[PDB]
Design a protein around this nucleic acid. Structure first.
Lengths: 288, 192, 1011
DNA sequence: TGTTAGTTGGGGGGTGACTGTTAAAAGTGCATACCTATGATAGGCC
DNA sequence: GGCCTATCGCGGTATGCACTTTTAACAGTCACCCCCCAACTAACA
């Protein structure tokens, strides 16, 4: 995997994160952990490789304070449709219960901060999993708007930050994450981008709720299935309502292309369809 | 207000350049010959022209194609969305007009009996020449008035000839439509 | 006026001159498309179209290479059939100009045109002498060329003009199979007593006419067993709206069909290929009716776009075959032939000499009408996409549902991304779904191929003639490797398949009827309140956080649908006698063709059916009915037969009470292991004991005799394993030997060791190792390692064990399978030797890039179809559905190696079943087969057991392992290079495990071998 | 029952074709890449 | 041979490559066709 092995980078990161409780993912050799402890941070290390645990614990014993080392793979927490049968895999409810972290309302401020690096070959998987957890208000996001800072590759970074301004890289994950969080580049290490993802307070609305996000994901995947086609073409396969009327409601013309729609255009589209009043049903969603 | 007219056009190719420069000379030396023969002799001149001479025109065409690349690039990047839409509309409409003209002119090329002449058409054809009037419109209105003032007995010959042309058109329609069936074009037959 | 008229005339004449001037001026997918187009044009008689396309292709440099001699032969045969001598000569000119060589089919076309046109004996003679100089054979024309009876007649007429004394070979003397095991089946030496049906000849002719009408219509309308209550206004309004909408869709589909045929026709006028003639193969009214039927039957949840294309393609092909036979006179010849065939089965008719249905059928004729080869897969796919897209585009409906100006498509395709690769799906409009739900249509429609036949099926005479009278049916169900298995079924000697054909014909000839009382009760529960405890699905009213409730609701709806169809067909066949034609898989296992209603179904399904022809109980019929009853109850599985009979005598009062008052009495039957079958057996026993003479009661209820772990029986027989023979009741004993109990014990000791080691799954499985769990588990490992069809059933059986933590059910099923494997291999070391021998041999055979092939002891060739990596995709404006062509590159070594032993065992049990059926038929017994179970009348259970044991001993008495080893040696150890792999392969094949001491003859004396 | 368009004839005016070659644009058949998502043994690579 | 890695109707969409058809590029003259005038009507929907 990826591990922070440079001391200078560890110090720079320590000053950035210090800028509360810090959850460090996959510390490995523990250079970043030691930099945080020297900088005065309160650290819980979620180490996926048990071989790294002793030294880290020793370092903690050097401080002998509130540092806590757990044998846990953050990217395998709470498996979807799983039987909960693994030591490295855990439940965020039990982990946070042991760490004494209490849930706060969505509107409340950031209760906890998680930092680390995406897997070198699992960036898309991790982004999708965290997206599901975020929009579903499960896992860590059951406790509030958790701030997540992660190192990511340049390709997935550009794809994540793309928009109609850069149509070739605009994708579903771009829409989901740009709507979900205010993403900001905190550091660039040659290329790896340390991205800060803070969930937006106003993500959920009267018509976009943790109860109907799945229909929105279905709409996004469906639309990006044929990115070159017209929006009305896809709408004719998603709702019995007048597709031209909806598109006009969201201020788009009939010839509007999918790649030209902004994330807020997608969100206002979904909310507009959900808002319809005089119909027995608004969506055609029926999939296992 | 036509974007297509201001769009940079493709440069003239080597041969077409040679013809564009030779044609005025051949026309000066042969003012009465038909353009057909001059273009033919110019093409033969091009075929007889040594490759080393054509190469000059080819190089000129290539440089003109580079400058055309720059011009078309800047132009396309300069067009606003509405201008792209109007250009697409002009392109589509022009294509539709091409199809309409080709199809109608085709239908005219196919030798088919003209539709039947009415008694009024017959009367206009017989009396137009002697009808007073300063223009064909005024003479046609005159023929219209004199027709409206005609009695039923004065019209008997024109109606008879109209019927006879009806039978003529019927028969010639049968024969021709059959001949079109031979050519495998049953779409031109009367529908029902 | 003569001036103007003459001007018009002159212009017209000049126009005529202008008219004179205008008149003066290695198989491949595309090759498959073109050839299919040309062959298709012969059936629609659109010869000028195909000739136009062929000429265009020939005239182009790059297109001429695409043409093939077979195509030129196709157009040539078309012109020969039309008598266009000049155009046929022109085609011969194209053939000669393209070089290449003319063939027998070409000369047959020329002879056809000369005979039809009555050419001179000089031209015919000259043609026959040019054919003689070319080296072609006169007799090879009538034999090697596929020609209709009209082509044969015309060619004969042409030949008889020059050579009047030319006679075809004397035919048709059929040859008899000389197989070791079928010898006494086909030998005339012996007293045969083939059974006859209870229906008279005229009755069988009326039923044959009914079935013929049903197949000609291609549809079956059955009254629904639903719709007990109905709203007064809602159903009326929804029905009026639905009828109007169906008229609108009918008209719109007609117009769209004509417009599409026109478009494709113009595309043929251009240099492009199109499916025009394929749409001209079937009546437009039939196409519209088929599309409307598919729309009416489309599931509310939707159907895969590709799957729907396939279905439309299959129904199109079927209706085209039916139409062709209809218009080609094959129907009349089938009527005469079948009407003569019915003499063998009818009670009031006799035949000159006794014979099997296939033998008699071939004896009467046997022209067998004509065989039509199916279309290439790309044609099927493109046609399906055409019909589907046409239906979607043509069908519109207003969105207002329950002032409907707006129009939206009735069908809309949406996308499922569950599989990482999105697949197109066709979903109906929800307003349409609610419309059909409110309408509550009281009728259901089935395909004629999906319901039982109203007359005895056609005897299986070849791998392409069988089952329903007109509709073509494959001899082997297996779709994967269908080309290989079919081509090898036609490659093997025709006599080799005699046994299988006669067995399948025998199974199909079994007359069935519905149990009125059982149907009345099952419907009474279904029509009112369902009974999940008795396998009767409950209506949606009884459906029960939200996600779980929706899941349970969907499952209950599925089961409700299946039961609706099955019980509806049962009600339709209430007062009728019907037959179920049988089919085979690649392993040889037989399965009924009608899937909805057949004896292979659940307990309810098995209880709804009984033999149409009865059999007097005799001296032991009643005892066999009681023993069968106890077996169905499952209360005395371990007890001997005498104690089962005594127990039946004990609970006789509960039997009579259960029969008389099933739902109001003591309801004892509901406690049995098979409640509905047990109840039926109680009714039969009641009728028997309450009859004046129980020995003379004509009993119709079938009695079952099952082989416990038949696979382990075959392995114990192959290796002569005494421990195995004892475990699986091959060795005689007064009490039944339960291998599941011993295996459960050994697995219990292993579980004690692993549980002592601290393993979690072994700790949680403590006290759960039961007979049923290990019965289904062993039945899994024997019948199948991997491909978790049975594994899922085991998971279900564990999930129904309330006291088990459902988190380990998956891991617990895997662990149980592994422990059963290890245990069986420990207590049955010889079995491990045979299994490892076959497995390794298959591994080495497949490792050389060749699939494992063998021949059953009855002469049936079996080939494993597991292959991978064949794909090509079309694109209709624009989904791009993929397709798996029949051309395979590499075999799947894993599936082959794991599959060889169990598949071979399948061929062994199938061969045993077939021998039992064939020999039981000679004694006049009614025999049907469900997986391992053999059924017969209570009057003949003893005789059936005798035939079973005799045929088992005879089967395994041959050197099956030796013959198989030598077979694989000859077939796969012949490659001259490399020789090393053939030396290791031979080294493993000749390592046949030595047999044990067990005396196979003891099977003849084992009472509980099959019980 | 309502809409189209082709004749009846002339005269003025806009417009495609015929003579030619060059190559840029653009329509076929095929192989390929992507998007996303989750404990034993056999094959492939070094 | 030894060690490491992937696995238990592959999906539809859209991109580069080898080929072949279509057209936009230059121009002078001659024939056409459009329109108008109104009316009439065979043909089509």
């Amino acid at each position: 995997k990826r591990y922070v092995t440079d001391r200078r980078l560890a110090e720079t990161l320590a000053q950035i994160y210090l800028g509360h409780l810090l959850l460090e993912c996959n510390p490995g050799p523990g250079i970043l952990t030691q930099a945080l402890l020297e900088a005065g941070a309160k650290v819980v290390a979620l180490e996926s490789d048990k071989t790294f645990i002793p030294h880290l614990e020793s370092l903690g014993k050097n401080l002998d304070g509130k540092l806590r080392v757990i044998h846990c793979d953050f990217f395998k927490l709470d498996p979807r449709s799983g039987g909960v049968i693994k030591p490295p895999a855990m439940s965020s409810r039990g982990l946070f219960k042991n760490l004494g972290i209490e849930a706060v309302p969505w509107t409340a401020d950031i209760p906890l901060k998680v930092v680390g690096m995406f897997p070198s070959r699992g960036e898309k998987r991790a982004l999708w999993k965290l997206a599901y957890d975020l929009y579903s208000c499960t896992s860590i996001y059951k406790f509030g708007r958790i701030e997540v800072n992660m190192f990511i590759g340049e390709k997935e970074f550009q794809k994540l930050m793309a928009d109609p301004g850069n149509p070739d890289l605009y994708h579903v994950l771009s829409v989901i994450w740009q709507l979900a969080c205010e993403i900001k580049v905190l550091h660039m290490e040659p290329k790896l981008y340390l991205i800060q993802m803070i969930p937006r307070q106003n993500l959920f609305t009267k018509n976009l709720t943790p109860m109907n996000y799945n229909i929105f994901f279905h709409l996004l995947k469906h639309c990006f299935g044929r990115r070159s086609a017209t929006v009305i073409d896809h709408l004719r396969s998603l709702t019995p309502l007048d597709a031209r009327d909806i598109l006009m409601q969201i201020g788009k013309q009939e010839d509007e292309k999918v790649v030209n729609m902004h994330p807020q255009d997608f969100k206002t589209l979904f909310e507009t369809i959900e808002r319809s009043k005089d119909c027995a049903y608004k969506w055609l969603y029926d999939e296992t | 207000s036509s974007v297509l007219a201001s769009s940079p056009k493709k440069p003239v190719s080597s041969y077409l350049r040679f013809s564009k420069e030779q044609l005025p000379i051949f026309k000066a030396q042969n003012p009465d010959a038909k353009t057909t023969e001059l273009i033919r002799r110019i093409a033969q001149r091009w075929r007889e022209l040594p490759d080393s001479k054509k190469k000059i025109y080819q190089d000129a065409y290539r440089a003109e194609w580079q400058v055309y690349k720059e011009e078309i690039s800047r132009f396309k990047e300069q067009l606003t969305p509405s201008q792209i839409m109007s250009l697409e509309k002009e392109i589509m409409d022009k294509h539709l007009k091409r199809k309409a003209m080709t199809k109608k002119k085709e239908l005219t090329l196919l030798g088919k009996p003209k539709r039947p002449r009415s008694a009024y058409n017959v009367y206009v054809a017989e009396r137009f020449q002697e009808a007073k009037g300063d223009s064909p419109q005024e003479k046609l209105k005159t023929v219209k008035e004199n027709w409206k003032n005609l009695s039923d007995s004065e019209k008997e010959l024109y109606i008879q000839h109209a019927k006879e042309d009806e039978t003529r058109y019927h028969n010639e329609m049968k024969s021709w439509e059959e001949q079109m069936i031979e050519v495998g074009r049953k779409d031109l037959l009367r529908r029902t | 006026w003569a001036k103007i008229l003459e001007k018009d005339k002159r212009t017209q004449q000049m126009r005529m001159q202008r008219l004179k001037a205008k008149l003066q001026m290695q198989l491949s997918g595309q090759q498959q498309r073109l050839l299919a187009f040309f062959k298709c044009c012969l059936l629609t008689d659109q010869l000028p179209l195909a000739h136009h396309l062929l000429v265009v292709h020939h005239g182009q440099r790059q297109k001429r290479k695409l043409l093939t001699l077979d195509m030129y032969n196709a157009v040539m045969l078309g012109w020969a059939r039309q008598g266009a001598f000049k155009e046929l000569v022109y085609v011969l000119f194209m053939v000669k100009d393209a070089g290449l060589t003319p063939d027998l089919l070409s000369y047959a076309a020329a002879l056809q045109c000369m005979g039809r046109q009555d050419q001179d004996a000089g031209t015919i003679e000259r043609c026959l002498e040019q054919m003689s100089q070319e080296g072609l054979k006169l007799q090879a024309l009538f034999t090697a060329v596929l020609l209709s009876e009209e082509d044969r007649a015309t060619v004969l007429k042409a030949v008889h003009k020059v050579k009047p004394t030319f006679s075809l070979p004397p035919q048709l003397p059929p040859p008899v199979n000389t197989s070791k095991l079928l010898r006494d089946v086909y030998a005339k030496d012996g007293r045969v007593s083939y059974p006859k049906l209870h229906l008279p000849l005229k009755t069988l002719q009326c039923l044959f006419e009914k079935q013929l009408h049903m197949e000609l219509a291609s549809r079956v309308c059955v009254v629904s067993v639903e719709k007990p209550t109905l709203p007064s206004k809602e159903v009326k309004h929804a029905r009026k709206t639905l009828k109007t909408l169906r008229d609108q869709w009918e008209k719109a589909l007609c117009r769209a069909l004509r417009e599409t045929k026109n478009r494709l026709e113009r595309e043929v006028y251009e240099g492009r290929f199109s499916l025009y003639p394929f749409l001209c193969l079937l009546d437009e009214r039939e196409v519209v009716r088929m599309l409307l039927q598919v729309l009416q039957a489309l599931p509310a949840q939707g159907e895969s776009f590709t799957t729907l294309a396939r279905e439309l393609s299959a129904r199109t092909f079927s209706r085209h075959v039916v139409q062709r036979q209809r218009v080609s006179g094959q129907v009349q010849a089938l009527q005469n032939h079948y009407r003569k065939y019915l003499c063998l089965l009818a009670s009031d008719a006799e035949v000159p000499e006794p014979c099997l249905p296939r033998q008699y059928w071939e004896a009467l004729g046997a022209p067998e009408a004509l065989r039509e080869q199916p279309w290439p897969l790309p044609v099927q796919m493109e046609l399906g996409k055409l019909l589907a897209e046409m239906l979607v585009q043509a069908t519109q409906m207003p969105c207002s549902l329950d002032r409907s100006s707006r129009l939206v498509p009735v069908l809309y395709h949406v996308y499922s991304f569950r599989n990482v690769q999105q697949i197109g799906i066709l979903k109906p409009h929800p307003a349409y779904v609610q419309l059909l739900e409110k309408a509550a249509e009281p009728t259901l429609t089935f395909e004629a191929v999906d319901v039982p036949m109203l007359c005895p099926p056609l005897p299986w005479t070849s791998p392409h003639s069988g089952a329903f009278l007109l509709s073509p049916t494959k001899l082997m169900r297996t779709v994967e490797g269908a080309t290989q298995h079919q081509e090898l079924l036609e490659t093997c000697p025709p006599t080799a398949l005699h046994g299988a054909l006669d067995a399948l014909t025998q199974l199909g000839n079994c007359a069935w009827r519905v149990n009125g009382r059982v149907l009345d009760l099952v419907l009474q529960l279904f029509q009112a309140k369902g009974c999940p405890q008795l396998g009767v699905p409950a209506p949606p009213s009884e459906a029960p956080e939200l996600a779980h409730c929706q899941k349970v609701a969907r499952e209950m709806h599925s089961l409700r649908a299946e039961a609706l169809y099955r019980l509806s067909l049962a009600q339709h066949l209430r007062d009728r006698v019907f037959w179920l034609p049988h089919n085979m898989d690649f392993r040889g296992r037989t399965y009924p063709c009608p899937p909805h209603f057949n004896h292979l179904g659940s307990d309810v399904a098995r209880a709804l059916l009984e033999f149409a022809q009865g059999r007097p109980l005799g001296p032991h019929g009643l005892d066999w009915l009681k023993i069968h009853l106890v077996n169905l109850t499952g209360l005395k599985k371990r007890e001997p037969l005498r104690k089962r009979l005594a127990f039946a005598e004990e609970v006789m009062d509960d039997i009579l009470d259960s029969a008389d008052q099933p739902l109001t009495g003591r309801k004892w039957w509901m406690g049995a292991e098979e409640p509905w079958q047990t109840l039926a057996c109680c009714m039969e026993v009641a009728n028997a004991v309450r009859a004046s003479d129980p020995a003379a009661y004509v009993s119709h209820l079938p009695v079952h005799q099952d082989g416990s772990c038949n696979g382990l029986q075959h392995y114990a027989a192959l290796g002569r394993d005494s421990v195995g023979a004892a475990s699986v009741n091959l060795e005689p004993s007064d009490v039944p030997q339960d291998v599941y109990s011993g295996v459960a014990a050994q697995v219990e000791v292993f579980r004690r060791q692993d549980a002592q080691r601290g393993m979690r799954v072994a700790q949680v499985l403590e006290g759960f190792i039961t007979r049923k769990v290990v019965k289904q588990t062993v039945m899994t490992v024997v019948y199948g390692v991997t491909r978790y069809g049975g594994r899922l059933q085991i998971e279900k059986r564990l999930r129904e064990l309330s006291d088990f933590p459902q988190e380990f059910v998956w891991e617990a099923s895997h662990y149980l399978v592994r422990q059963v494997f290890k245990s069986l291999q420990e207590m049955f070391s010889g079995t491990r030797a045979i299994q490892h021998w076959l497995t390794e041999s298959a591994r080495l055979i497949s490792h050389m890039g060749s699939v494992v092939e063998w021949v059953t002891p009855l002469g049936v060739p079996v080939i494993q179809p597991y292959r991978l990596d064949s794909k090509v995709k079309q694109i209709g404006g624009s989904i791009t559905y993929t397709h798996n062509g029949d051309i395979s590159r590499k075999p799947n070594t894993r599936k082959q190696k794991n599959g060889f032993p169990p598949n071979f065992i399948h061929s062994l049990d199938s061969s045993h079943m077939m021998l039992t059926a064939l020999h039981c038929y000679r004694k006049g017994l009614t025999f049907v087969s469900v997986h391992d179970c053999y059924w017969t009348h209570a009057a003949d259970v003893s005789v059936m057991n005798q035939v079973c044991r005799e045929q088992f001993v005879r089967l395994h008495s041959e050197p099956i392992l030796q013959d198989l080893s030598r077979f694989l040696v000859k077939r796969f150890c012949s490659e001259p290079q490399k020789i090393l792999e053939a030396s290791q392969l031979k080294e493993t094949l000749q390592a046949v495990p030595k047999p044990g001491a067990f005396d196979l003859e003891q099977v003849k004396r084992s009472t509980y071998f099959f019980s």
